[PDB]
Amino acid sequence: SGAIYVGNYRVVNRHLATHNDWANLVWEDSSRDLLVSSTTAQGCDTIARCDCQTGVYYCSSRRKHYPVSFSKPSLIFVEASEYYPARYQSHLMLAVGHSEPGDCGGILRCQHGVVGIVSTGGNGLVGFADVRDLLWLDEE
Ligand SMILES: N#Cc1n[nH]c2ccccc12
Ligand SMILES: [Zn+2]
Protein backbone atom coordinates (compact mmCIF):
# COMPACT_ATOMS: atom_id res chain seq x y z
CA SER A 1 0.00 0.00 0.00
CA GLY A 2 0.90 3.72 -0.23
CA ALA A 3 0.05 6.98 -1.98
CA ILE A 4 1.48 10.32 -3.12
CA TYR A 5 -0.17 13.48 -1.72
CA VAL A 6 0.49 16.63 -3.82
CA GLY A 7 -1.83 19.70 -3.70
CA ASN A 8 -5.47 18.46 -3.72
CA TYR A 9 -4.44 15.15 -5.39
CA ARG A 10 -3.99 11.62 -4.09
CA VAL A 11 -1.99 9.33 -6.42
CA VAL A 12 -2.46 5.57 -5.84
CA ASN A 13 -2.00 2.28 -7.67
CA ARG A 14 -5.17 1.93 -9.82
CA HIS A 15 -5.62 -1.68 -8.53
CA LEU A 16 -5.59 -0.47 -4.84
CA ALA A 17 -7.94 2.54 -5.45
CA THR A 18 -10.79 2.66 -2.82
CA HIS A 19 -14.54 3.43 -3.35
CA ASN A 20 -13.69 7.00 -2.16
CA ASP A 21 -10.89 7.27 -4.78
CA TRP A 22 -13.32 6.19 -7.60
CA ALA A 23 -16.08 8.47 -6.20
CA ASN A 24 -13.58 11.44 -6.30
CA LEU A 25 -11.87 10.30 -9.56
CA VAL A 26 -9.71 12.99 -11.31
CA TRP A 27 -7.78 10.76 -13.75
CA GLU A 28 -7.04 7.05 -14.26
CA ASP A 29 -4.99 5.02 -16.78
CA SER A 30 -5.42 1.20 -16.68
CA SER A 31 -2.31 0.77 -18.92
CA ARG A 32 -0.22 2.64 -16.23
CA ASP A 33 -1.82 1.18 -13.03
CA LEU A 34 -2.41 4.78 -11.83
CA LEU A 35 -5.43 6.54 -10.39
CA VAL A 36 -5.56 10.09 -9.05
CA SER A 37 -8.42 11.21 -6.75
CA SER A 38 -9.22 14.63 -5.25
CA THR A 39 -8.58 15.47 -1.58
CA THR A 40 -10.01 18.21 0.69
CA ALA A 41 -6.64 18.47 2.62
CA GLN A 42 -3.54 20.05 0.91
CA GLY A 43 -0.78 17.47 0.14
CA CYS A 44 2.88 18.08 1.12
CA ASP A 45 4.76 15.83 -1.46
CA THR A 46 6.79 17.32 -4.34
CA ILE A 47 6.86 15.49 -7.71
CA ALA A 48 10.31 15.15 -9.39
CA ARG A 49 10.62 16.94 -12.75
CA CYS A 50 13.74 15.26 -14.21
CA ASP A 51 15.16 12.24 -16.09
CA CYS A 52 17.01 10.69 -13.13
CA GLN A 53 17.65 6.96 -13.46
CA THR A 54 18.82 6.59 -9.84
CA GLY A 55 16.86 6.94 -6.62
CA VAL A 56 15.75 5.23 -3.40
CA TYR A 57 12.50 3.28 -2.94
CA TYR A 58 10.69 2.05 0.14
CA CYS A 59 10.16 -1.75 0.28
CA SER A 60 7.43 -2.56 2.89
CA SER A 61 8.18 -6.37 2.68
CA ARG A 62 11.75 -5.63 3.95
CA ARG A 63 10.95 -2.48 6.04
CA LYS A 64 13.94 -1.02 4.12
CA HIS A 65 14.76 1.73 1.63
CA TYR A 66 16.99 0.54 -1.24
CA PRO A 67 18.97 2.65 -3.67
CA VAL A 68 18.38 1.56 -7.30
CA SER A 69 19.23 2.25 -10.93
CA PHE A 70 16.03 2.14 -13.02
CA SER A 71 15.13 2.19 -16.72
CA LYS A 72 13.37 5.23 -18.34
CA PRO A 73 9.56 4.92 -18.46
CA SER A 74 8.63 2.38 -21.20
CA LEU A 75 5.94 -0.05 -22.40
CA ILE A 76 6.85 -3.34 -20.72
CA PHE A 77 5.18 -6.81 -20.59
CA VAL A 78 4.13 -7.66 -16.96
CA GLU A 79 3.39 -11.35 -16.11
CA ALA A 80 0.16 -12.41 -14.28
CA SER A 81 -0.77 -10.73 -10.92
CA GLU A 82 -3.64 -11.30 -8.39
CA TYR A 83 -4.77 -7.72 -9.36
CA TYR A 84 -4.12 -7.78 -13.18
CA PRO A 85 -3.99 -10.20 -16.13
CA ALA A 86 -0.68 -10.72 -18.02
CA ARG A 87 -0.56 -7.48 -20.11
CA TYR A 88 1.52 -4.48 -21.33
CA GLN A 89 1.95 -1.73 -18.72
CA SER A 90 3.04 1.73 -20.00
CA HIS A 91 5.24 4.44 -18.31
CA LEU A 92 6.89 1.66 -16.28
CA MET A 93 10.47 1.84 -14.93
CA LEU A 94 12.31 -1.40 -13.96
CA ALA A 95 15.11 -1.94 -11.40
CA VAL A 96 16.76 -4.98 -9.87
CA GLY A 97 15.28 -5.29 -6.41
CA HIS A 98 12.68 -6.91 -4.19
CA SER A 99 8.92 -6.28 -4.79
CA GLU A 100 5.96 -8.33 -3.54
CA PRO A 101 2.31 -7.39 -4.24
CA GLY A 102 1.84 -5.48 -0.92
CA ASP A 103 4.94 -3.41 -1.77
CA CYS A 104 2.77 -1.54 -4.30
CA GLY A 105 2.54 2.16 -3.39
CA GLY A 106 6.08 2.33 -2.00
CA ILE A 107 7.55 5.64 -3.20
CA LEU A 108 10.68 5.94 -5.42
CA ARG A 109 12.45 9.26 -4.77
CA CYS A 110 15.39 11.17 -6.27
CA GLN A 111 16.92 14.57 -5.23
CA HIS A 112 14.11 16.30 -7.28
CA GLY A 113 11.27 14.59 -5.28
CA VAL A 114 8.80 11.73 -5.96
CA VAL A 115 9.58 9.78 -9.16
CA GLY A 116 6.84 7.11 -8.98
CA ILE A 117 5.35 4.27 -6.96
CA VAL A 118 5.97 0.52 -6.85
CA SER A 119 3.54 -1.18 -9.30
CA THR A 120 5.09 -4.54 -10.35
CA GLY A 121 7.43 -7.19 -8.91
CA GLY A 122 8.69 -10.81 -9.29
CA ASN A 123 11.80 -12.48 -10.85
CA GLY A 124 14.01 -10.16 -8.73
CA LEU A 125 12.73 -6.98 -10.49
CA VAL A 126 10.74 -4.05 -9.15
CA GLY A 127 8.63 -1.96 -11.51
CA PHE A 128 7.69 1.64 -10.71
CA ALA A 129 4.80 3.58 -12.31
CA ASP A 130 6.34 6.92 -13.31
CA VAL A 131 4.43 10.15 -12.30
CA ARG A 132 7.04 12.73 -13.45
CA ASP A 133 5.24 13.34 -16.84
CA LEU A 134 1.94 14.28 -15.04
CA LEU A 135 2.79 17.99 -14.97
CA TRP A 136 -0.83 18.86 -14.03
CA LEU A 137 -0.31 17.35 -10.50
CA ASP A 138 1.75 20.60 -9.75
CA GLU A 139 -1.16 23.16 -10.07
CA GLU A 140 -4.89 23.50 -9.07
N1 LIG B 1 9.96 7.07 3.37
C1 LIG B 1 10.47 8.08 3.17
C2 LIG B 1 11.08 9.36 2.88
N2 LIG B 1 12.38 9.43 2.59
N3 LIG B 1 12.63 10.73 2.24
C3 LIG B 1 11.51 11.50 2.32
C4 LIG B 1 11.29 12.85 2.04
C5 LIG B 1 10.00 13.35 2.19
C6 LIG B 1 8.97 12.53 2.63
C7 LIG B 1 9.20 11.19 2.92
C8 LIG B 1 10.47 10.66 2.75
ZN1 LIG C 1 15.50 13.47 -10.30
Describe the model.
Homodimer. It comes from Coxsackievirus A16 (strain G-10). The active site is at 15 (for protease 2a activity), 33 (for protease 2a activity), 104 (for protease 2a activity). The protein is mainly beta and 140 residues long. The protein folds into two domains: 3-44, no CATH class; 45-140, no CATH class. 4% of the residues lie in helices and 51% in strands. It has a seven-stranded antiparallel beta sheet, with no helix packed on it. The protein has a three-stranded antiparallel beta sheet with strand order 1-3-2. The site of zinc ion has 6 residues, from loops. Zinc ion (ZN) binds next to loops.
Give the topology:
Blueprint: E1 3-13, H1 19-23, E2 25-29, E3 34-44, E4 54-59, E5 64-69, E6 74-78, E7 87-96, E8 107-110, E9 113-120, E10 125-130
Antiparallel strand pairs: 1-3, 2-3, 4-5, 4-8, 6-7, 7-10, 8-9, 9-10
The structure holds 1H-indazole-3-carbonitrile and zinc ion.
1H-indazole-3-carbonitrile (K4R) binds next to loops.
